[PDB]
Amino acid sequence: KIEEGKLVIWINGDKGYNGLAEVGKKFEKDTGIKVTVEHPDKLEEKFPQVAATGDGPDIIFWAHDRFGGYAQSGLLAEITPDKAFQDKLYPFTWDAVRYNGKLIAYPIAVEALSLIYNKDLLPNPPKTWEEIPALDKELKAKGKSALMFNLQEPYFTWPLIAADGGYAFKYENGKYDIKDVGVDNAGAKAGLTFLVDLIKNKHMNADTDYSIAEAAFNKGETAMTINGPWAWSNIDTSKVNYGVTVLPTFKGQPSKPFVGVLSAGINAASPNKELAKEFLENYLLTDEGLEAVNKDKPLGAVALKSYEEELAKDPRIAATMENAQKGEIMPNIPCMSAFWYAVRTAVINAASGRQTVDEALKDAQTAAADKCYLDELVELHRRLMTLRERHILQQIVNLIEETGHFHITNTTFDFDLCSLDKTTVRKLQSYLETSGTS
Amino acid sequence: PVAAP
Numbered sequence: 239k240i241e242e243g244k245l246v247i248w249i250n251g252d253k254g255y256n257g258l259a260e261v262g263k264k265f266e267k268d269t270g271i272k273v274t275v276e277h278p279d280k281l282e283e284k285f286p287q288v289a290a291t292g293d294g295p296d297i298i299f300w301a302h303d304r305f306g307g308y309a310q311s312g313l314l315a316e317i318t319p320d321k322a323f324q325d326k327l328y329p330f331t332w333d334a335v336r337y338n339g340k341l342i343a344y345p346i347a348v349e350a351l352s353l354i355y356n357k358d359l360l361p362n363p364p365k366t367w368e369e370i371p372a373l374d375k376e377l378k379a380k381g382k383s384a385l386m387f388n389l390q391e392p393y394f395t396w397p398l399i400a401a402d403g404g405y406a407f408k409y410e411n412g413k414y415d416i417k418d419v420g421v422d423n424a425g426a427k428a429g430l431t432f433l434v435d436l437i438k439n440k441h442m443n444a445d446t447d448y449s450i451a452e453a454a455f456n457k458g459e460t461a462m463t464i465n466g467p468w469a470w471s472n473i474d475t476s477k478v479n480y481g482v483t484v485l486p487t488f489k490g491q492p493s494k495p496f497v498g499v500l501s502a503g504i505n506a507a508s509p510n511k512e513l514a515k516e517f518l519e520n521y522l523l524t525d526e527g528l529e530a531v532n533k534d535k536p537l538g539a540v541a542l543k544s545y546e547e548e549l550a551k552d553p554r555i556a557a558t559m560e561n562a563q564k565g566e567i568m569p570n571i572p573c574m575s576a577f578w579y580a581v582r583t584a585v586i587n588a589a590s591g592r593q594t595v596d597e598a599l600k601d602a603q604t605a606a607a608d609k610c611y612l613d614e615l616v617e618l619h620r621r622l623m624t625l626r627e628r629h630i631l632q633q634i635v636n637l638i639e640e641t642g643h644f645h646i647t648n649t650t651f652d653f654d655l656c657s658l659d660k661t662t663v664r665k666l667q668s669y670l671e672t673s674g675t676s
Numbered sequence: 677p678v679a680a681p
């Protein structure tokens with residue numbers, strides 16, 4: 239069980255947990271309540287495991303994409319800030335933390351990856367991915383490499399894959415759906431093939447992870463890396479004269495990073511919901527609260543308007559905003575964990591030779607789309623089975639009759655959502671949004 | 677599986 243009369247907070251090990259502990263100490267000084275900041279490994283997976291049993295932290299920090307799944311599992315408490323508080327943050331950050339009409343977390347900061355380059359090795363960074371192979375050859379003759387970045391997490395490689403591939407998701411009929419060719423298209427295959435070719439030509443290594451790439455850039459061994467705002471502190475400490483800029487284009491197309499909104503959710507099992515709200519609204523989401531976290535590890539473009547205006551003149555933040563505008567806001571639907579596993583497996587498999595790029599992305603697409611579509615059908619089934627009104631029921635039955643995919647018993651008109659074409663299912667969802675019923 | 681009256 240969770241201890242009453244104190245706050246336990248989990249946040250990822252790459253964020254400013256020491257700066258957040260300083261906000262916790264300020265809360266403790268004023269209220270008497272102790273705040274403990276922890277950074278367990280794999281916390282995005284640890285949280286749904288421990289919170290399912292009524293345990294875990296009072297507050298969980300992560301990008302908004304995982305929160306829809308936590309909320310669907312009943313693991314988050316609904317947050318209730320008043321209009322005055324909501325007006326303090328940008329409206330699009332509230333949209334990122336809204337799930338089924340309800341606010342399920344407080345947005346903190348907007349994150350996007352950027353190209354980070356060492357100005358003493360490369361005063362002019364490449365504008366295209368295409369010019370990176372020759373640039374690497376030129377740097378290898380001087381004992382350096384062109385680029386090193388985490389190849390193990392799809393968050394870092396997706397920008398290149400989606401440059402000519404486009405967005406993986408679309409918003410339709412009140413929900414995010416994964417596109418039928420959002421992962422499997424010709425542009426995405428071209429991007430992943432470019433990445434695999436960089437590996438085969440010895441310009442990158444398939445086993446390069448986060449620590450390896452961070453250590454190489456911070457030691458001046460590689461001219462470029464791909465990372466988010468949290469990484470800038472370790473670069474400052476290493477004294478690399480660095481620049482933060484737009485990611486390289488592929489086939490003239492901008493790289494499209496997935497944009498995450500670092501958010502704070504309150505565990506549904508917490509006996510300290512009111513203290514958590516006070517801490518988040520009155521201590522963290524203030525200029526002084528965000529500065530303490532930001533000075534430890536930069537947050538990026540913060541959700542709080544007053545503090546964002548103070549950091550707007552930072553060229554590194556303008557680069558973050560530029561890359562975020564070229565990218566895609568992550569959906570928060572529960573199948574996001576299956577989408578990430580699918581893309582992770584595809585990149586690893588293509589880089590190692592286990593699968594061809596075409597087969598890797600074809601399999602990622604079917605795995606992510608089958609899980610996302612099944613979740614949508616589970617929800618549509620739940621919604622249809624509560625309807626009672628004659629006119630609405632008759633119209634759904636009419637739409638099914640047109641297809642002939644139904645059977646009749648002595649007492650019911652039956653149909654399986656899995657036997658319908660996706661076009662009929664979209665007609666059902668489209669009609670249901672007009673019915674006024676949810 | 678949907679069943680309607």
Ligand SMILES: OC[C@H]1O[C@H](O[C@H]2[C@H](O)[C@@H](O)[C@@H](O)O[C@@H]2CO)[C@H](O)[C@@H](O)[C@@H]1O
Nearest residue numbers: 250252301303304391392393394498578
């Ligand atoms: O790689 C898949 C992974 O991507 C995102 O995680 C990011 C996170 O948003 C950043 O704040 C930072 O910590 O790096 C992570 C990538 O290592 C998604 O938020 C996450 O759910 C997903 O699994």
